[PDB]
Design a protein around this nucleic acid. Sequence first.
RNA 1: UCCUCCUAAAGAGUAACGGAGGAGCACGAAGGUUGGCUAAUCCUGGUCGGACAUCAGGAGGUUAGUGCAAUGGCAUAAGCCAGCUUGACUGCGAGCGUGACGGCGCGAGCAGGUGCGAAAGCAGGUCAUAGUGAUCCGGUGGUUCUGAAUGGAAGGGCCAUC
Lengths: 116, 136, 75, 64, 50
Amino acid sequence: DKKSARIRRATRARRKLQELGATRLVVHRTPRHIYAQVIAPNGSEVLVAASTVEKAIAEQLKYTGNKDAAAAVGKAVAERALEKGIKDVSFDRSGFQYHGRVQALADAAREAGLQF
Amino acid sequence: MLQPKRTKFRKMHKGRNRGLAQGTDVSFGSFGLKAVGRGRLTARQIEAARRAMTRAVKRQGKIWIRVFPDKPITEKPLAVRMGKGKGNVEYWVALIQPGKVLYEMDGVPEELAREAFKLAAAKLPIKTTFVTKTVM
Amino acid sequence: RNGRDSEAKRLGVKRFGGESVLAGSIIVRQRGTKFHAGANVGCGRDHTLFAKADGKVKFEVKGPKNRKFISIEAE
Amino acid sequence: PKIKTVRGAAKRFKKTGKGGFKHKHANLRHILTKKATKRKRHLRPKAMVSKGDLGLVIACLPYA
Amino acid sequence: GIREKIKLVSSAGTGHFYTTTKNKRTKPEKLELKKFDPVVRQHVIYKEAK
RNA sequence: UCCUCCUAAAGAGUAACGGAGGAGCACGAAGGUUGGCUAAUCCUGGUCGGACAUCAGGAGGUUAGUGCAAUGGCAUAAGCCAGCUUGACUGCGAGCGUGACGGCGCGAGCAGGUGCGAAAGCAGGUCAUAGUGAUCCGGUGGUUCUGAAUGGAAGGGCCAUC
């Protein structure tokens, strides 16, 4: 199962970040509408979220679910986090290879202020 | 001569015979021999009792043995000093607690059943009593 | 041909639930991981659990496998 | 006659300010390849004589 | 105990060396690990020797 | 002498010429890190091929495996595969466990300099528990520390190691 394999892949990282006790930037990727979220160390609340599923961010990019979409979401999370106040975060692959859209989102985020 | 096959260990501790019997009810036949006393039965005693009943019933009915030795017992050779390791295994015994059902039987009249069990109990070292299958 | 044995390794729980410990103190000595490290608890190379912070030690059961965890709260 | 110091003892223990004794650790002479650096490192510094055997050391070197 | 002990000598002029073991029967070639030399306080190549 | 289980009486420890077995290693990788993967046993179809080679599907969920006997542990895998590597590093070390002692074990963290990863991070050997021998005497390399009139040297000391 794709989901079961993915959860098994990301379990070690999630546990490592959980015991470390640090805010983590978690990204969920699908064939469309790449998501992104910021989670408190306790893991119970979401500091801020962004994605291409809402019209506020989906009204510019031609198509959601590409490199451009990842950069927009990656950038979008940036100023939101900077405005909120949190600066340092830990990136979570969530079992997605850090190659394409995931890398583009992270690259946009780190260059936008969320260094990690 | 009941005996296990390829037991895990050749020797085992003496242990104790405290407690109370578990198989206290007739489960296969209609009549059974219940153990009143406490002790151990060797393989030879079980065989002797079994032969006594089979002859008594004249190979009529069914016989169930509800006890297995599964416990080796050692014995030092004559003119041997204490120590120098555990003794060699000689015979196998089954620990019996009060209420244990030794033998079960079915397919014969109650009258013939009583004498058959009485003959067997005469060749056992523990007080025994005759019981009948209960309804629930 | 018997008669051989090994010196006892004095394993077991050294600090029990609800008693304060200092950082670096050994909590449990074990061969495997009968208890898993929780919060402010580190695991040694020999699966020894030691306190990484000062506080009260507590035991709990967590996870889908109901495996036992040892944590420390700063109290 | 005056007491004779145990010369062998005098070559292995040195007296300190508070009456203690310092000695070299006794496992760092040879067969060192198979030893971890951590264990060799900890044996390098001098150590104090234990209480139990302190009384024995006092008798051996009553003058020093 | 076929495995025998060797000495790793730093490529630098310093006389510092490491000691280890190896099996000459299976891996007869020299050992060229890159280790830390505290005399010069740098990581340098260490060569196998007696 | 050392290791594992039981005896051992639910903390630790606990004897017998009591009951069972092992060790005197191995590995520059079988170590470090990063990425990925998940067995045994059965059922059905299929050339040699056959109960038991390899292929496909299904039940199964670890009865597999874990370099070596046993116990405990291991899916975040400690099990299996691949890339890059030498942290199997130096000086330390709060605080603990264990011993009559000699001693043995665990260890966050600090300084220096490294490897893997985008990064958080991990790495001071190996899933852990056996694979080991005090001191004396002497050998090898470094270090003006000392060097008995002086300058050297011999010989000692210190460090690494046999």
